[PDB]
A paper describes a structure:
The SARS-CoV-2 translates its genome into polyproteins that must be cleaved to release individual proteins essential for replication of the virus. Given that Mpro processes the majority of these sites, any intervention that stops this process, such as an inhibitor, would block viral growth. The crystal structures of inactive SARS-CoV-2 Mpro, with the catalytic Cys145 mutated to Ala, with 9 substrate and 6 product complexes were determined to sub-2.5 Å resolution. As in previous apo and inhibitor-bound crystal structures, Mpro crystallized as a homodimer.
We used 12-mer peptides, P6-P6’ (with the scissile bond between P1 and P1'), in our co-crystal structures. Six of the nine complexes were solved with the dimer in the asymmetric unit (in P21 or P212121), with both active sites in the homodimer occupied with the substrate, while the other three had a monomer in the asymmetric unit (in C21). We observed that the substrate peptide was extended along the Mpro active site with the scissile bond (P1 glutamine to P1’ residue) positioned between the catalytic dyad in all cocrystal structures. The N-terminal (or non-prime) side of the substrate had an antiparallel beta-strand conformation which was conserved in all structures, with the substrate residues and side chains well resolved. The binding mode of the C-terminal residues (prime side) was more varied, especially beyond P3’ position, and lacked full electron density. In addition to the fully conserved P1 glutamine, which is stabilized through multiple molecular interactions, the large hydrophobic residue at P2 was extended deep into the S2 binding pocket in all structures. The sidechain of the conserved P1 glutamine was also extensively coordinated in another hydrogen bonding network. The volume from P4 to P2’ is highly conserved between all of the substrate complexes, despite the variation in amino acid sequences; this high conservation reflects the specificity and likely evolutionarily-constrained regions of the enzyme.
Author numbering:
A (entry chain B), D (entry chain B): 118 to 127
B (entry chain A), C (entry chain A): 1 to 305
């Protein structure tokens, strides 16, 4: 349950 | 008539979106004049995101480590530097589609439009609000960082947000275009929680005036109230306190409908104490708080750009 | 994570919007190649809108009666003709910003993005659905006719709607880009009513799968049902019948979450018979029916254009 | 209570 840095693809 | 979550036209912002790759990491960048702005965790590896020192990570990189792509054309990076949590990549070409733009920082309760992007390409546009806990309830997946929030006035695009991360609760955090985070959030993949959120009261009243303008008047009552008696009920239901400036901001909508603000506050008091009883307001069963008074005036008067 | 009413990027459509004036009447036009498309009631006067014969009104006009403005430039009209309820104004200049486009007609329950315009200038963008009664619940004021609804696939803009009128109930009516109205509505300022609307059931289930994808599972139950027992309850609550094709369309979302469609239908059955009991799904207290299964897959997989 | 053709200005 930690934050997510939203990089890479998709 | 009608009232929708309306976002600004995204054309001006679409022309400034690029893809920034560094190593195995890629995200979206904002290209204005000869500078590309992107979140700084692009220089991070998957194993270097729990406790990263961006000062160390950045001096470990050169200009050739940054792959900047604008469509088919690969932009040549000729300078790089850090500004808080964003990266400024100087490129040899100025963006010919650069509009008149501004870098502003907004207050909780203000709204803006988001152009969610992936690999530099726009995927959608929706409306958002800066929650009182400095989060936003957005729609973001992996690779959406670098997407920007903005408002448009006349010809000028007021950039006010850049996407960075998603909190464990599902809400999202980010910075202004100078790289300064909204709220007490840092760009580390660590356990982080936002402060308890509250309802933007002045927005709910503005949304109530929007309903009256569009023929929804079932919630209106003959009763009035004082600002102090209303705020005592607002605090019990986790609503933000209403200030005299709020009553002055709602002035135009108050005169246009002939409903005093304190009279409208009495309708909100009843809706909060009794609920809606199976009814709907503007097609919603919840009191909407993501419409500023300007948002209502904009939608109900047809202001263009 | 997160789920919002997300509209398509409007840049490609913004470049095709013009202003069409005829007499004292003005509205928005769609400029593709050397043709401008606009609603035909632009040739109407205020007194000529109760019972207008557009065949008579059009032959009473010449090419010089049509003021077409693209920004500062006034487009020269060199041809005019009527196609059902739209006007085709041939101009001497092809729109250089013309994208790959299509003229499609959508089915009730399908969604699209609207670029509300006034005087040829875009004012906002929002998402809409074609209701089962062929109306749309939009946000339109006087002078918004000629605004278009559209979808975007890859590089191709699929134009599917053009705005015309507002019904007395506040809902709006319009045509496809060939000028054929959606539903039994005519472009006269007369008393007109739409058929009773129903809830798009397959969209509600798709929106329920969107909630499961984003961590909202409080409505799930261990029970299942058959397509016939569910449809018997759907008819009682004014929901559209669920077909086997609907169950096949929801296939991807069903496998991605591991929830059978008929199992999800049992959750919808309970929500319809018991309500939500103060709970919310994806930040809404009502069952949302303006998200197609493709809309959910698009938002939750990050498809760009 | 009649329909409105939404042209002219605004």
């Amino acid at each position: 349950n930690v934050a997510t840095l939203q990089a890479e693809n998709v | 008539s009608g009232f929708r979550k309306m976002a600004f036209p995204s054309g001006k912002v679409e022309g400034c979106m690029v893809q920034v790759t560094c190593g195995t990491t890629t995200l979206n960048g904002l290209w204005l004049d000869d500078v590309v702005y992107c979140p700084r965790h692009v220089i991070c590896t998957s194993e270097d995101m729990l406790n990263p020192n961006y000062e160390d990570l950045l001096i470990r990189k050169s200009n050739h480590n940054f792959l900047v792509q604008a469509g088919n054309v690969q932009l040549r990076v000729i300078g790089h530097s850090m500004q808080n949590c964003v990266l400024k990549l100087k490129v040899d070409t100025a963006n010919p589609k650069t509009p008149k733009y501004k870098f502003v920082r907004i207050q909780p309760g203000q709204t803006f439009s988001v152009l969610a992007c992936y690999n530099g390409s726009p995927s959608g546009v929706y409306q958002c609000a800066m929650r009182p806990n400095f989060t936003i309830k957005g729609s973001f997946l992996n690779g959406s960082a670098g997407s920007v929030g903005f408002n448009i006035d006349y010809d000028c695009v007021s950039f006010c947000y850049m996407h960075h991360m998603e909190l464990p609760t599902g809400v999202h955090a980010g910075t202004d275009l100078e790289g300064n985070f909204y709220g007490p959030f840092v760009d580390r993949q660590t356990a982080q929680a936002a402060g308890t959120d509250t309802t933007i009261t002045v927005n709910v009243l503005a949304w109530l005036y929007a309903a009256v303008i569009n023929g929804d008047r079932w919630f209106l009552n003959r009763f009035t109230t004082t600002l102090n008696d209303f705020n005592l009920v607002a605090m019990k239901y986790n609503y933000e306190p209403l200030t005299q400036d709020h009553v002055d901001i709602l002035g135009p909508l108050s005169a246009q409908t002939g409903i005093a603000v304190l009279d409208m506050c009495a309708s909100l008091k009843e809706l909060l104490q009794n609920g809606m009883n199976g009814r709907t307001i503007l097609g919603s069963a919840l009191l909407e708080d993501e419409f500023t008074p300007f948002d209502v005036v904009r939608q109900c008067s047809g202001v263009t750009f």
